[PDB]
């Protein structure tokens, strides 16, 4: 039977929620992942740290599509992120698309995943999630947006940020390299330059994962005949495109 | 740190579940019980410690039957063995109801194993304090299995558990080494009587009562029957001659 | 203190119960490896029968999950059979609900999601097993996907699991760096079984008899396990190599 | 519908028509009423198409799980699963099933599950709306341990008569031969059996 | 079983204190300062953002001030996620009241419902309380303009001016010094900005570090959440920054 | 008897050049007995208008439900709901009660604030979206409204003419229905202006 | 309704009419009855229009989630099984009669699903009230190995037969072609055989014709 | 000792300390003896009193016309167990028109008691039961312990100082086993046995309870003056 019907995350006398701080610690030991918002798109990048060279990297995809216009990356415990992306994809349909016929705005999906994480920090017999997420999305009435969601369920909108090991250094770089006149290609370039410091090993299309929320891709739609159906804005960059943009640094 | 052995389903730093090992300690303190798979069946035997002569002889049966073809004996906490046998009877009943055929011995073994192993996944329950030797005859022949408090079960040419499990095992191995072609049903019955008498030496202070059952394709037509009457006395006499 | 007994976070952001389950995976002292061929996937495992009273045919750590998916488990046999029964149930339910055979990687993801649940909910302990699923998927070809107590899962060009895991891993890495391909360029599954046995004998440094091995082969629309006689045929054919 | 299953020396043969009707309208004239629930365990379905499809799908799931756990199931076991589904849900089902299987121990086996969820093991079974017109013929012509050719001819003649008299039966005649050699699919077209 | 791991979040201390309530109040004490001021013709809410960076977007940011309906808003101090849970429940309760009575929910009724929700966690369930304190600014026809506060204990109080979060003692002393009953809403804006500038921990008080809202009066009540540009304008207008 | 025919009433929407029009009768009765001369069946949430005909209690219940839902929508999204999104919302809400339906016939009308396109839509009692760019009719006199609209309508009408068209349609349809009439209201809706007019019609 | 589906050599086409009726009254003159379950899995619906739209949207949402979970192109047999089991659960009370076609990694597929949950396979299928007319056309013209153009012509002709001869069908012809390897082609109003002729009069009224009792501005701000 | 917190904790030795403490709760209970022949079965019960103004607590409970029990330990748990046994006998009589065999009743009690030794929350029953019954197999006497172990005996005793009566019956076995068809002599043997377990007391009319079941004798309880002839 399930006798754990009590909170496993309580306030310490200092006021800290110990499990939330320890989950944030677990996030801090995660592989560096960053996001940069431009004026014509958002970019999210991370390193594809593979344990064994026998493991196929393509199956270990750290960037995940949530809606055709909203994608996600993480830093922390992979499996928590996987079950979180599954829950997020489901809630995008159950709580919105099946109600309004359109996919949810980025902020609303972010708040839904934040609600899931907050439940994880207060429900009975459960630990918080050991991940921090970067959600990059586009909706018609808010444009492009980039949000960060923490194990506590707190989420904040960033012009650009990073999470993981190189978080502080990467964020300093971004602070001194970002401007409100930035372009999607310039943002991809800055993301590559910021990852180059947080990746000590080989740095090619095979070892990094990069995706964008840019313009609509009708070729990625799969069907033609609906002028209102523009296409998906989320596009994961292939290893070849990453290499082509790396050779010109 | 410490306290890893206080709760069930808790991994120790070396990857062990100490509550299961304490259950095994509880098993080892039980009476001896053996099973011998022969050419066309299986035989089960158990020592019943006659604590006093106020016990009604031939009563207080330990060998239990599941369906009409499965025999189960256990060493350890007798009530936990009865609980496990009740669960196995429910499993066999549901299997017969759905698939018509009586439950095969490996299928029944996996039912019991999943049940026992599930009893090692939560701190709200205690692992089973029994080890169980069971088996019988299905469409694929004779099968003998032994199942541990951990939920681990395996198929055995011969099995033994309890206090005199060591001696018994040795004796069993001698059988396997002396005639690899196999024993007949009645030969296995007499040999099980011998092995129980030999393994009783670890409990020689108190008197004991032998109890034997068997499930043979030729001698019992695939059904599980207690070895009683003239055959039981014959096995007892064979044991008396083998000890002296 | 108690943060070492249930699946909650230690101050260092660690789940000690998951690590101790990983430790428990090596309790059986059995190594196994999996390799991909041109159109097949082979899994070899060590077969250690310590007791003379044991029926060797019932001593197994390879499971026939579906008609196309095989699963080899590194860990205690109770948790192994638990995970194997769960995987068989999930595969059957998948075929029923979606009308096509469950893909290897999807079953791996399912078991990995359950493992993640065990590491996040405190009432259930993690399973001390590492599950290696092999198949010949209709869309991916020969596939090897591994799941661990942490809820992590990943596909492999080849893999190995057990105490001597790293040695076999190194041997395979070296062979694939030399061969420059990610599989075994052999047409028959017998030759791939031979290759796997050869490289395990080379990496472990021990010979194998027919009663020391367990071989599972996955081909298009079939997964089977070799008998002692088929393994003996493979070993005899190895003798000429 | 008109369905049957006949045991013979080498195994079993299932036969069916191909007509699915919504009243006097033929909704489908190429219907496959022979459904595989296991490698050498098939069934002929009659009655509600939706009900028979759902029952066959659930039986196939149960037999797949049964095979994954305990090995290849006997034909009697498939009949038992069909029987449990049809009897425990007799109030909401309109399904008459003929389960035919082959194994090496029992050669061919035929079970029939009519309305109400009873099961009957028979040397051959006929079912469906058209089977009513061939009871006397099949009883007078069936023999034990026929050859494959004589069994195909027996099924062909019986089903041709049933199609001739039953307006709810028609189309092509489908057959599935279950033997140790495996599974064989046979089809016979109207221009072939209408002149029989 | 599991009883060894149960921290028992809903028990009493030997002094008659709720451990978790006290610890959550201590947690909130480190949250960004929020101030509410009730003038005779309006209400003002101001709050300082604890999270600050050059790279944090402010246009799309809502961390401290939230709309409950069209006549009631909240200033938050503490765990933002618990705050959003409670805010969603409060919005639902307000809309329930509207559907049932075809009238906007009176401010005290909504505050009391949210406080009962908070208190429930401190008496049963064995769960941790919500680490959030609220300042409710609302208007209804019965009582006019209303200002309330609610802490994790489930207790709620009504104020003319009040502060929650960091430096509540200093802010309360300053408000008690400079508050007059007959003042207008603009003077209250000035006083709130002055208190936030005098009790801030940063060097200077900028538009990027604070959120602002006004519930004022056309015969109707308008609820305005101040934009970054409006915040910058009101800051240079009250003499806290230049240009 | 029939829940959609107990209270009576009609709603009709039309599209013109950069405008919509939505009109309803004013009668609420219980079969032959007429009770209320002031029962308007058109409501608006922000800038999206919804007319509801059928069972009066269900009309009121749906109005309150959609007010609830659109207020929560505006609180969560910080913007008013659009007519197409609101149409999908009405469809999903109606189908949620598929086997215990509301006996209503909703009509959505409005100008999309971001695209400026006029938009009207209609549903049945279980929420089947009827996307028509010209006109949508609903109520007891749905057949009369169908005839009047199919005859009188021409596309791209200025508001002053679309008003006359929709008003004549509503009036002449209501005159041939026993359970409709007793007054009428017409909303002419442009992007930045909405005019509401009470028509003079027969009071029988 | 009149919906048909025809398999050709390299894919499958589905087609439908655009008429929606409430009894004898034409409710919608251009209803879109071709619903997209997935980019390459489409299906035409007949019966209770709300039920068809709802069941297709639900199964498409679940299929999208399933494809995200499994990282594979969705399979037509998956949509088929989901629809059949959902319809069977409701014993025909969800009056949806669908023709589901598409292409997936396993090839091109065409099935029909009836409201009670029964599914059928064929090279050409028809459903709706005009199904008997369209099916007449199909039985008269279908042949093995059709080209894309031959199949589009056959499907459009079947829909036209249903339009002219069945009172429940009319207006235009919607088509969706799905070839193996190509994107799905959704031809909305592929044909428009019925277009209302020009009216004899403009019925525009002179402003001031309608008597107004009271006028007021509405605040939507 | 950290292993006696509940019944779901095995000690390193393999022991269940809560079960042992329930057994110790029995050992603190008053003495009761049971014995049987081939035609009859007798329970004798020395019911304890709280003081001289107290009532000697009811110690023998009837379960059916052919079966009953006496208790030693926590009277409430014996009430629960006896009610369960009554319901099982009643179920047998109603559904099968069949008197429940005493062995089956012992098995049912064993399972009911075992259910409490493996689940968190709740405790084992703190009672020991002596169950007599005459069924199709003759006379039967069973000893039941909280551990779940139920054993069929010719005679036994449970409670404080029960070893005296135990050894008495061990010596008198061949004597009382042959008291067939003379209930008074069997009751006298049982009373002598229960007398062997007295230290500073002597059986009187108030503190004696007898129960008899047999071939042509339904389960009957004698209290008060009815037992005076056996003192
Ligand atoms: C489109 C769904 C309409 C439907 O379900 N029709 C049923 C009921 O007539 C039907 O076609 N039954 C066939 C069985 C086949 C389908 C397996 C049958 O058994 C005979 C008479 O028994 C009639 O051909
Ligand atoms: C909207 C009014 C309420 C409604 O549900 N009408 C139904 C049937 O009255 C309807 O329009 N059915 C069409 C199917 C399409 C619209 C998906 C159809 O199938 C043929 C006959 O089968 C009729 O044209
Ligand atoms: Mg756990
Ligand atoms: Mg015919
Ligand atoms: Mg009228
Ligand atoms: Mg009138
Ligand atoms: Mg027509």
PDB file of C-alpha atoms in Angstrom, chain B residues 36 38 42-45 183-195 210 212-214 227 231-232 235-236 238:
ATOM      1  CA  UNK B  36      12.773 -34.868  -5.592  1.00  0.00           C
ATOM      2  CA  UNK B  38      11.933 -38.265 -10.711  1.00  0.00           C
ATOM      3  CA  UNK B  42       7.805 -35.330  -8.212  1.00  0.00           C
ATOM      4  CA  UNK B  43       7.874 -36.329  -4.547  1.00  0.00           C
ATOM      5  CA  UNK B  44       7.637 -33.966  -1.581  1.00  0.00           C
ATOM      6  CA  UNK B  45       8.656 -34.799   1.968  1.00  0.00           C
ATOM      7  CA  UNK B 183      14.638 -42.522 -10.090  1.00  0.00           C
ATOM      8  CA  UNK B 184      11.229 -44.127 -10.377  1.00  0.00           C
ATOM      9  CA  UNK B 185       8.299 -42.753  -8.386  1.00  0.00           C
ATOM     10  CA  UNK B 186       8.334 -45.321  -5.569  1.00  0.00           C
ATOM     11  CA  UNK B 187      12.142 -45.273  -5.489  1.00  0.00           C
ATOM     12  CA  UNK B 188      12.004 -41.492  -5.110  1.00  0.00           C
ATOM     13  CA  UNK B 189       9.475 -41.884  -2.276  1.00  0.00           C
ATOM     14  CA  UNK B 190      11.721 -44.264  -0.343  1.00  0.00           C
ATOM     15  CA  UNK B 191      14.734 -42.031  -1.004  1.00  0.00           C
ATOM     16  CA  UNK B 192      12.861 -38.957   0.245  1.00  0.00           C
ATOM     17  CA  UNK B 193      12.004 -40.859   3.428  1.00  0.00           C
ATOM     18  CA  UNK B 194      15.698 -41.720   3.782  1.00  0.00           C
ATOM     19  CA  UNK B 195      16.760 -38.102   3.260  1.00  0.00           C
ATOM     20  CA  UNK B 210       7.613 -38.126   8.362  1.00  0.00           C
ATOM     21  CA  UNK B 212       5.397 -37.689   2.091  1.00  0.00           C
ATOM     22  CA  UNK B 213       3.255 -36.809  -0.921  1.00  0.00           C
ATOM     23  CA  UNK B 214       3.798 -37.376  -4.619  1.00  0.00           C
ATOM     24  CA  UNK B 227       1.862 -41.256   0.321  1.00  0.00           C
ATOM     25  CA  UNK B 231       3.820 -47.416   0.808  1.00  0.00           C
ATOM     26  CA  UNK B 232       4.448 -44.910   3.613  1.00  0.00           C
ATOM     27  CA  UNK B 235       9.443 -45.901   2.944  1.00  0.00           C
ATOM     28  CA  UNK B 236       9.782 -45.550   6.726  1.00  0.00           C
ATOM     29  CA  UNK B 238      13.680 -48.267   4.106  1.00  0.00           C
TER      30      UNK B 238
END
